[PDB]
Amino acid sequence: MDDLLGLLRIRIKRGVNLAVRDISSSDPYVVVKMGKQKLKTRVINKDVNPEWNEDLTLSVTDSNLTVLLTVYDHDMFSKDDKMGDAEFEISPYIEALRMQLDGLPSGTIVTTVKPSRRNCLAEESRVTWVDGKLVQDLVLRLRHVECGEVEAQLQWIDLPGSKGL
């Protein structure tokens, strides 16, 4: 689409020990923001360990963009409460995507991003080459909230027509 390098697939896997925002539980959904783009998972009802396993799909024009991720507690007839947020860099994953990864076996670890004061990794993050595809695993520790983390996996979808990688 005349800048599009392709499509970043953010597999939102699960939230672990998310914060309580209705008495006893929460109705968490995730909002992803990058540039003008804004994607949301479904609400999962009354579960602070929600298993979304939901794919959000963004278009990439910048190899060097931030993905902001925010969790909210859905309240149907009132205001939704904040449940924390994180952000992560996609540049390490895009750099790795232009790397000629043929030949390397399944399970080849190609880049490692480490937890820093300034990033939201709870663990170090593995850009792993597996089954012919380049995948990055993320455990994001949410900011600005008393507990919780979200597990995600980045994957990549090529778009025929676009500017390419």
Ligand X SMILES: C[N+](C)(C)CCOP(=O)(O)O
Q: Which residues are annotated as a binding site for Ca(2+)?
A: 21-22, 27, 73-75, 81
Nearer to Ca ion, 28 or 92 (CB): 28
Cβ–Cβ < 8 Å for 63, 91: yes
What string marks each residue from 34 to 73 as x (binds ligand X by CB under 6 A) or -? Answer: ----x-x-xx----------------------------x-
Q: How many CB atoms lie within 10 A of CB 19?
A: 19
Q: Which segments of 89-165 does DSSP mark as H helices, in order? A: 91-97
Regarding 75 and contact with Ca ion (CB under 5 A), the answer is yes
Among 27-35, 131-139, 140-148, 152-160, the segment contacting Ca ion (CB under 5 A): 27-35
Residue 133 CB, nearest distance to a second copy (Å)?
8
CB-count exposure of residue 144 (10 Å: 0-12, 13-18, 19+): exposed
- Which residue pairs from 106-115 have beta carbons closer than 8 angstroms and sit at least 24 positions apart in sequence? 106/130, 106/131, 110/134, 111/136, 113/89
| 105 contributes a contact to a second copy by CB under 8 A | no
Q: Name the binder of 31 from Ca ion, ligand X, a second copy, none, CB < 5-8 A by kind.
A: ligand X
Binding residue (CB under 8 A) for a second copy from 5, 18, 48, 58: 58
* Stated length of the chain: 165
DSSP summary character for residue 95: H
- The residues in 6-25 that bind Ca ion, with binding defined as CB under 5 A, are 21-22
Q: Can residue 117 be called a binding residue for ligand X (CB under 6 A)?
A: no
Distances (CA, A) of 69 to 2, 77, 151: 26, 24, 11
Binding site for Ca ion (CB under 5 A): 21-22, 27, 73, 75, 81
